[PDB]
Design a protein around this ligand. Structure first.
Ligand code: FES
Ligand SMILES: [Mg+2]
Ligand SMILES: [Mg+2]
Ligand SMILES: [Mg+2]
Ligand SMILES: [Mg+2]
Ligand SMILES: [Mg+2]
Ligand SMILES: [Mg+2]
Lengths: 115, 293, 86, 109, 168
RNA sequence: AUAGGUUUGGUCCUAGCCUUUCUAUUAGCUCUUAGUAAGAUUACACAUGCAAGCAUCCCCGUUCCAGUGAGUUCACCCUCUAAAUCACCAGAUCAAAAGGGACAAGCAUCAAGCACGCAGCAAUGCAGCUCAAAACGCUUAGCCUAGCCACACCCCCACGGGAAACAGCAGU
């Protein structure tokens, strides 16, 4: 489908079945459908912990670097995954959400103790 | 220095000890069968074909390397404590770039505590299996390697099968690989089944293990009983090479031992069953003279 | 066997058969020595030598005759007329 | 070099010289038959610009692709005449030949 | 039975059994040969046997035959650069002709196997997708992972139909 | 196909039809639970609700996603090179238009098409071009499925007209 504009984005294509999410980190034209055509599959992400309590993320780091050099963008979930991996700095919203969670749990603990 | 398992002299000695039984090496495999093909061959053509099969058997019996147990991986890359408590599950990030040796891939783990460490050896092997699956290897360790099942396979005398499963499932430096190989070698020693590994690629490893543990008495006894006295002599020479400052080697050097003399010297020194070895050698020599004269 | 009665026909046929026995060479006592393509009148029989445990994948009549002969493993395709006698 | 014509080099037979400075060339390619798995000749027609008009019906010619089509159908130029009709010169010996017979014996030189 | 003499020539196995894969430079191959003469037997058998294999291995090279046009048989390759390679095949057998053309204008085994490895690069073992492209279709096929809900139902606590009940 | 039934008074051969196998839709009868996948027959007409916002105003988006299969060799490779991304440029990536090639089925009781070519800077000249190796034509069909092509009420298009549009979701 001849698209106007748009750009390559490294993003998560959601496969899996109902209640069984699974993601394919793909470099795809941003205008293409979420689970539709893609240029290259750069990795995968299993949000469900496995038998060992691990969320398996596979990153084709060489090709991710190649596409970032070619000018691909990064969806925020992929940015946060890379930050977790250490490939990028931790996302500002990762840090801020951690801080918000800390404040919320501090409130909870303080209220529980007061009670 | 002391020679290693991969040195050329040791490789030659161990290959000669192993032997190249074509029937055993190319024993028919219980697998999906296709109808056979038939060729008309002269005597020269048949000799050429058997020579090619011998070369193929050498390739097939190429010994696996003996590698020291890998050291545990403990290396923390980052300590981002801000992530502490944000997630309750580990993330395992794998570099699945195609053109990278699996011992060079970066497989890191982000823990719930915010620690970005390097994946342990077990996790590394598990993830490499997950993403670059190998034929014959399973992610979850097969239960056959539990002692209760390993002893069943030993009782059936499937030591070669146990070693094959171990070599398919674990890495040569794996703790489990080394443990299972040593256990199989020990059981072969106890039950005197050293012929189960002859003409297989694991005979070299078994011999190396016995030599390094100074327990080649049983193997010498079996070889003399089976008349492979050249193999026994090479085994004793290898033992002396790997223990140059040993009582038996020094005694042989003091005397002039160049064969059955070497085996007798080993029987008299550095042998837990020296009397038995001497009896076996005496019986072999007596039979040799009997059917020679 | 020809007879006005079915049992007499059976007796005649099975008694005459034993005086007209072939001997079939079986490779390793389970199959034939090589692939055989033949045409008897308008019936083509294409028999393939097969490995052990393959079974008899043949016309049912060929399966019966092979069980009698002693062949365990063989493939067989019958083209043309399927006349049982031919 | 960067020609937009698919067939860069094609050897064909001239089947018509009725157009000025153009030679109609029949180029045959072996095309596998998917069912019979046998190679048959698939012939296509190419117009080859011939500036000098030196092509005769029956000549085997080598056509080179023009950098761009110079006409609605003339995408090739007459690169060479490999076998002039009736005036073949055996490439092996460079002597004129009439079919399988040497018009000049190669021993002549 | 298969029609024609030597019906093995009409099998994919035979066609792929050819070992000549021309360099990218070769564009045309004209095979001039004589239908008669004991010296042209090699060229005759070449056209009868190996031309199908050469064409199968090189689908984009125009192979064109010529009959009784010159006293002696010969191949002539027209390359992309404009060069012409003449290969006089008189007195050679078809096997010798194949070896010669492979030596002078065919890709070497090293180049062919590097091209094979380059092709292999595309099919990454770690990619998940349809069977036509990937070894596995979903991570659920990997042991130790949460299995496919179709085969093994998920825990009610992991099903949103009951997370909703809990949140209600 | 490992075949089987069926012509005859009978046998042999050829031969069509049918059985046995696996799917999909529909219908009859029957039907307990759980998980998952799939889900109008109709390119016929649509009540009703929602499906495109964001943002310190400018811009950007509503050209995407989602839908359908009416039409249908616009999809694939090469050349060239727009628009777009790479904070600017960079060549890299992606990819239009244009040029070259390849590319569905049936009917030859569709066998001729009727200007379908070339050269020249132009003026103009030559009379050529496709086709029984299937041109021209009629009919049928979404396709080569990580998806692609085409359409988007009809007049192929949509200035204009007919007319007032769910082939977006739920629904009629
Ligand atoms: S196909 Fe993988 S979860 Fe269902
Ligand atoms: Mg029903
Ligand atoms: Mg009619
Ligand atoms: Mg239609
Ligand atoms: Mg409508
Ligand atoms: Mg319209
Ligand atoms: Mg609707």
């Amino acid at each position: 489908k001849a698209y106007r504009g748009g750009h390559l984005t490294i993003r998560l294509a959601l496969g899996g079945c109902t209640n069984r999410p699974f993601y394919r980190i793909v470099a795809a034209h941003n205008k293409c459908p979420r689970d539709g055509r893609f240029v290259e599959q750069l990795g995968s992400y299993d949000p469900l912990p496995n038998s060992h309590g691990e969320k398996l993320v596979a990153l084709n780091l060489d090709r991710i670097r190649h596409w970032i050099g070619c000018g691909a963008h990064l969806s925020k979930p992929m940015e946060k995954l890379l930050g977790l991996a250490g490939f990028f700095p931790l996302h500002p919203m990762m840090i801020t959400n951690a801080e918000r969670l800390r404040r919320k749990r501090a409130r909870e603990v303080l209220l529980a103790s007061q009670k | 220095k002391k020679p290693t398992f991969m040195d050329e002299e040791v490789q030659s000695i161990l290959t000669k000890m192993t032997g190249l039984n074509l029937q055993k090496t190319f024993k028919p495999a219980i697998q999906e069968l296709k109808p056979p093909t038939y060729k008309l061959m002269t005597q020269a053509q048949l000799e050429e074909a058997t020579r090619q099969a011998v070369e193929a058997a050498k390739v097939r019996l190429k010994m696996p390397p003996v590698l020291e147990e890998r050291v545990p991986i403990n290396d923390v890359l980052a300590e981002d404590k801000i992530l502490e408590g944000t997630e309750t599950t580990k993330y395992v990030f794998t570099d699945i770039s195609y053109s990278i040796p699996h011992r060079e891939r970066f497989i890191v783990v982000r823990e719930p505590s915010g620690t970005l460490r390097k994946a342990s050896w077990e996790e590394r092997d598990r993830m490499i299996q997950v993403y670059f699956p190998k034929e014959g290897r399973k992610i979850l360790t097969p239960i056959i390697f539990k002692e209760e099942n390993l002893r069943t396979m030993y009782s059936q005398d499937r030591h070669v099968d146990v070693l094959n499963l171990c070599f398919a499932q674990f890495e040569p430096d794996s703790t489990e690989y080394i443990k299972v190989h040593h256990k199989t070698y020990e059981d072969i020693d106890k039950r005197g089944k050293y012929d189960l590994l002859r003409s297989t690629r694991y005979f070299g490893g078994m011999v190396w293990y016995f030599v390094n543990n100074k327990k080649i008495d049983g193997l010498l006894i079996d070889q003399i009983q089976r008349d492979l006295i050249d193999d026994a002599t090479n085994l004793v020479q290898l033992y002396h090479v790997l223990h140059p400052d040993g009582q038996s080697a020094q005694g042989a050097k003091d005397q002039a031992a160049e064969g059955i003399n070497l085996i007798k010297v080993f029987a008299k020194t550095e042998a837990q069953k020296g009397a038995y070895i001497e009896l076996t050698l005496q019986t072999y020599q007596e039979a040799l003279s009997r059917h020679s004269a | 066997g020809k007879a006005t009665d079915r049992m007499d026909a059976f007796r005649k046929a099975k008694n005459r058969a034993v005086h007209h026995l072939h001997y079939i060479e079986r490779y390793e006592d389970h199959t034939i020595f090589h692939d055989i393509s033949l045409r008897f009148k308008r019936t083509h029989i294409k028999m393939k030598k097969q490995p052990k445990g393959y079974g008899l994948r043949c016309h049912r009549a060929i399966i019966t005759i092979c069980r009698l002969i002693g062949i365990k493993d063989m493939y067989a395709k019958v083209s043309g007329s399927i006349n049982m006698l031919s | 070099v960067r020609s937009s014509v698919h067939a860069r080099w094609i050897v064909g037979k001239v089947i018509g010289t009725k157009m000025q400075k153009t030679a109609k060339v029949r180029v045959t390619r072996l095309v596998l038959d998917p069912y019979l798995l046998k190679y048959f000749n698939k012939r296509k027609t190419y117009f080859a610009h011939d500036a000098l008009q030196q092509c005769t019906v029956g000549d085997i010619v080598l056509l080179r692709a023009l950098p761009v089509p110079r006409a609605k159908h003339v995408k090739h130029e007459l690169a060479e005449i490999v076998f002039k009709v009736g005036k073949v010169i055996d490439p092996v010996t460079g002597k004129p030949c009439a079919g399988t017979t040497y018009l000049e014996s190669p021993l002549s030189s | 039975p298969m029609k024609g003499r030597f019906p093995i020539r009409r099998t994919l196995q035979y066609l792929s059994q050819g070992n000549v894969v021309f360099k990218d430079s070769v564009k045309v191959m004209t095979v001039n040969y004589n239908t008669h003469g004991e010296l042209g037997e090699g060229a005759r058998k070449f056209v009868f046997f190996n031309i199908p294999q050469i064409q199968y291995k090189n689908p984009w090279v125009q192979i064109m035959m010529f009959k009784n046009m010159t006293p002696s048989p010969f191949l002539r390759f027209y390359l992309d650069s404009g060069e012409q390679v003449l290969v006089d095949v008189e007195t050679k057998s078809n096997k010798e002709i194949m070896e010669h053309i492979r030596k002078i204008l065919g890709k070497n085994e090293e180049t062919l196997r590097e091209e094979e490895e380059e092709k292999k690069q595309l099919s990454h073992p770690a990619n998940f997708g349809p069977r036509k492209y990937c070894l596995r279709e979903c991570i659920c096929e990997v042991e130790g992972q949460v299995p496919c809900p179709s085969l093994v139902p998920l825990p009610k606590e992991m099903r949103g139909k009951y997370k909703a009940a809990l949140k209600a």
